[PDB]
Design an enzyme around this catalytic site. Structure first.
Site, PDB file in Angstrom:
ATOM      1  CG  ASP A   1      -4.243   3.580  -2.011  1.00 55.80           C
ATOM      2  OD1 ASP A   1      -5.372   3.028  -1.976  1.00 55.80           O
ATOM      3  OD2 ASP A   1      -3.705   4.103  -1.000  1.00 55.80           O
TER       4      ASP A   1
ATOM      5  CE  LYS B   1      -4.417   8.036  10.235  1.00 52.18           C
ATOM      6  NZ  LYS B   1      -4.526   7.149  11.443  1.00 52.18           N
TER       7      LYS B   1
ATOM      8  CG  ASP C   1      -2.002   1.148   1.174  1.00 50.00           C
ATOM      9  OD1 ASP C   1      -2.860   1.137   0.252  1.00 50.00           O
ATOM     10  OD2 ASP C   1      -1.991   2.047   2.059  1.00 50.00           O
TER      11      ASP C   1
END
EC number: 2.7.7.6
Length: 863
Positions: free
Chosen positions: A792, A611, A517
């Site tokens: 992805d 985040k 990933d």
DNA sequence: GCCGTGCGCATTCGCCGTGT
DNA sequence: TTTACGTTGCGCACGGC
RNA sequence: GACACGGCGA
């Protein structure tokens, strides 16, 4: 009356013999037949849920809400509004005392009355049999009152509504709750007195029936929707109309299939429709999930051979259910106390029934609705893998969304949550080998959440836990350590493979799909196209002995500024006149940077505070957006946890923090920010309606945005504004309506939507093209045939991971080395409409010093 | 022409389901 | 047939002494 | 080109 729906003939879908021999001989009658049985089931399951949903809505007087009522509701509404208006005229031109009803029907708008009449009576009839014109009339009269009463506090002097009462309404659900809540708002709108002070004078049940009666009559007069059964008397639905909803509902339930995986390789794509499944059923698959046909036709004769090769190689990947994992999943999910975190509760919770208890309720409430939701899904993904448990292999058909991203078509597929991914594995395995083993262990490290540290460290982590892992594999229901890891079933799935190697060595045949990933695809791609060497290091596009953490890198930069302010910045205040807050009329304690920078440091600002914000940056999230995230994600939750008093005025605290995160991230990743503004200007200009400032004539109409991805996939972004007028009722929801102005045809682009979509949409289309290229690259240059794809995240079998690890980086590199996406984008729209002198269009942002070749030696980029 | 008011908008796309 | 805390500025648009 | 509420994927 009642609506009688009938089942459809799906047997038709049982393909002809000539097309059937296409499957037979190829895969053999047994399967060929089984597949078609499967596709036929899909349609039956779909019909099953439509009918169910329908019957549900019916037994709640929500028939008008169903998409089967709409076509007819939209033909009547006009005929009704017209009759109401005509009537209001006769009653006026007629001398003497006006009907007792006229006066009341004057509060609300005619169209509102018409809908509430169509809807309310539409329910009464299909629900019970108390279809007595006296009971129905009271129903109408009561609904018309509540709309009028609680409607003014919205339409009348009340913006306070779209502020302190609009959003809080969407929370309460059910005609009943929303009313008990407006009765509330109403009472407190008096302490301030918004509508002045005119307390709603009740209506009195007598009149509240003369109204209902008038409406019925008007309804019958304007359209025979209902008929007055001769007899106190009753009413019932007109046959032609009832038989109409039944017809629409019948058709509707045959184009709503619940797609399932295939038992044979899926049907190759050769066109824009028809690939995937083999039968030629009602809902043929579209290569592209466009909104409103026509767009799908744009792809009709487009030459994009590489796009096709990809969607095909992809769906040609054979999968199988992971039995060992299915074994434990089936049972451990029936436990009262499951070791896996947040994996529903077979049974519902409860609350402590004795300021205080207020939340003791709101809590368990929220908590349950959410759980009941996860349950439905879990049970389905579960009661579905069990169905394919024994098959030798299964397949999933693929198509793409309008930007190019590839999505599996079946409801149960490899791109689901953790339990779903764990249940699935690849069919075509291969002797793991020395390297497949190396990577398998890393896949396992990542599954445990240990992914923010270099490879040798991840190997050490696994080597260190040899015995824990061996134990979970031997007795998963007894040991359960695996259940405490970040992705428990995927981890468990790796435990069973890891043990296999121990028991069998490297000749051991493994097919577990190891995922690679990327970290923030959006930023990786902007940095890659703009050669940003600083934002590129932040997302691991460049070699380093350490793994970069964009969120940590940003938080770090926030403290750098957090210091510079704690002792070198603004001080308190008490509000002035037209300073920074535009122009307010009062005065509070406008805290200054030093005041704020103090509380935050007095909190401990880490990666977790940033985040959320960096993740949504690529979706266009800006400073305002962050104010929301930090508040909801960090403050509130901490204020409610009682462990956080640094904050006194949280809204001011967040505006600052949100400002700091914006600043730093704005220097951390410039290629991103910069390429995003550019993309937005281009979109802004093409969507603009250019009118000459002199004559007022349109020199150039609003334009859609188009571009082609490097692998040849074309994309057209054309958001459009609503065709009809949207009228929203207080309690009876919303409904559309034809345009009052005839000179409002065309279609009309939505310029605001063009701007907030272009950047993420452009990036997503790049990610997709990257995925597609990678797949074709891997399959042709290395011969890989199994791919797990999640936008992805690229995965294969251990024996193939070394070559995918390679391929994914060579394509990122080859692609960006072979063409400039932004300059290419420009060259597309510059000419082909954009003319006049709209040349305020900024210059392509400058490229940086990043050397893309480095991405090849980068170990943590993955993508 | 150039601002006081005034107001429209806040994060993208893809999907599935709905206690009493 | 009773739980829903939490509310701030920056921009693109009209008209106008 | 679809209310709201809840859940999941990137």
């Amino acid at each position: 009356n009642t609506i009688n729906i009938a089942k459809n003939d799906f047997s038709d879908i049982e393909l002809a013999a000539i097309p059937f021999n296409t499957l037979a001989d190829h895969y053999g009658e047994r399967l060929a037949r089984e597949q078609l049985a499967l596709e036929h089931e899909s349609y039956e399951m779909g019909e099953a849920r439509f009918r169910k949903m329908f019957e549900r809505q019916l037994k709640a007087g929500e028939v008008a809400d169903n998409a089967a009522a709409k076509p007819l509701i939209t033909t009547l509404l006009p005929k009704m509004i017209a009759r109401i208006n005509d009537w209001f005229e006769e009653v006026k031109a007629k001398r003497g005392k006006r009907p007792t009803a006229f006066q009341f029907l004057q509060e609300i708008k005619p169209e509102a009355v018409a809908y509430i009449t169509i809807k309310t009576t539409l329910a009464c009839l299909t629900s019970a049999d108390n279809t007595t014109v006296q009971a129905v009339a009271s129903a109408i009269g009561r609904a018309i009152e509540d709309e009028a009463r609680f409607g003014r506090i919205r339409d009348l002097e009340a913006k306070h509504f779209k502020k302190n009462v609009e959003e809080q309404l969407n929370k309460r659900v059910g005609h009943v709750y929303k009313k008990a809540f407006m009765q509330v708002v109403e009472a407190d709108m008096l302490s301030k007195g918004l509508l002045g002070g005119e307390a709603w004078s009740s209506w009195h049940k007598e009149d509240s029936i003369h109204v209902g009666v008038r409406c019925i009559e008007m309804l019958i007069e304007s359209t025979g929707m209902v008929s007055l059964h001769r007899q106190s008397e009753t009413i019932e639905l007109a046959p032609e109309y009832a038989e109409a909803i039944a017809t629409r509902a019948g058709a509707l339930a045959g184009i709503s299939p619940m797609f399932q995986p295939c038992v044979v390789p899926p049907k190759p794509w050769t066109g824009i429709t028809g690939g995937g499944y083999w039968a030629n059923g009602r809902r043929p698959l579209a290569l592209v999930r466009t909104h409103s046909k026509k767009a799908l036709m744009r792809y009709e004769d487009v030459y994009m051979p590489e796009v096709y090769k990809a969607i095909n190689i992809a769906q040609n990947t054979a999968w199988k259910i992971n039995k060992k994992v299915l074994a434990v999943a089936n049972v451990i999910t029936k436990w009262k106390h499951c070791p896996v975190e947040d994996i529903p509760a077979i049974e519902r919770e409860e609350l402590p029934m004795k300021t205080a208890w207020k939340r003791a309720a709101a809590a368990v409430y929220r908590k349950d609705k959410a759980r009941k939701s996860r349950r439905i899904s879990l049970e389905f993904m579960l009661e579905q893998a069990n169905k394919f448990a024994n098959h030798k292999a299964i397949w999933f058909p693929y198509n793409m969304d309008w930007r190019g991203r590839v999505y599996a078509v079946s409801m149960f597929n490899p791109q689901g949550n953790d339990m779903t991914k764990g249940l699935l594995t690849l069919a075509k395995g291969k002797p793991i080998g020395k390297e497949g083993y190396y990577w398998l262990k890393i896949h396992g490290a990542n599954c445990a959440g240990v992914d923010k540290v270099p490879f040798p460290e991840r190997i050490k982590f696994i080597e260190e836990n040899h015995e824990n892992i061996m134990a979970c594999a031997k007795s998963p229901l007894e040991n359960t350590w695996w259940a405490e890891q970040d992705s428990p079933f995927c981890f468990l799935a790796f435990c069973f493979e890891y043990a296999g190697v121990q028991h069998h060595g490297l000749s051991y045949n493994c097919s577990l799909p190891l995922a690679f990933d990327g970290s923030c695809s959006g930023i990786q791609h902007f940095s890659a196209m703009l050669r940003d060497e600083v934002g590129g290091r932040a997302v691991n596009l460049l070699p380093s002995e350490t793994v970069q953490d964009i969120y940590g890198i940003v938080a770090k930069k926030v403290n750098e500024i957090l210091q510079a302010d704690a002792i070198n910045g603004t001080d308190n205040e008490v509000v002035t006149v037209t300073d920074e807050n535009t122009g307010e009329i009062s005065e509070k304690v406008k805290l200054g940077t030093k005041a704020l920078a103090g509380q935050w440091l007095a909190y401990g600002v880490t990666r977790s505070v940033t985040k959320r914000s960096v993740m949504t940056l690529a979706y266009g999230s800006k400073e305002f957006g962050f104010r929301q995230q930090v508040l909801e994600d960090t403050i509130q939750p901490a204020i409610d946890s009682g462990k956080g008093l640094m904050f006194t005025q949280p809204n001011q605290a967040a505006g600052y923090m949100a400002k700091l995160i914006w600043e730093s991230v704005s220097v951390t990743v410039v290629a991103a920010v910069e390429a995003m503004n550019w993309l937005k200007s281009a979109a802004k200009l093409l969507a603009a309606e250019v009118k000459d400032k002199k004559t007022g004539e349109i020199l150039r109409k609003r334009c859609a945005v188009h571009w082609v991805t490097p692998d040849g996939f074309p994309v057209w972004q054309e958001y459009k504004k609503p065709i009809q007028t949207r009228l929203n009722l207080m309690f009876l929801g919303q409904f559309r309506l034809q345009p009052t102005i005839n000179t409002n045809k065309d279609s009309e682009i939505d310029a605001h939507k063009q701007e907030s979509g272009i950047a993420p949409n452009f990036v997503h289309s790049q990610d997709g093209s990257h995925l597609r290229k990678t797949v074709v690259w891997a399959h042709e240059k290395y011969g890989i045939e199994s791919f797990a794809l999640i936008h992805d995240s690229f995965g294969t079998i251990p024996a193939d991971a070394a070559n995918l690890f390679k391929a994914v980086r060579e394509t990122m590199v080859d692609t960006y080395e072979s063409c400039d996406v932004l300059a290419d984008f420009y060259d597309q729209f510059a000419d082909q409409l954009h003319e006049s002198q709209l040349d305020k269009m900024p210059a392509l942002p400058a490229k940086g010093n990043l050397n893309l070749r480095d991405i090849l030696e980068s170990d943590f980029a993955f993508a």
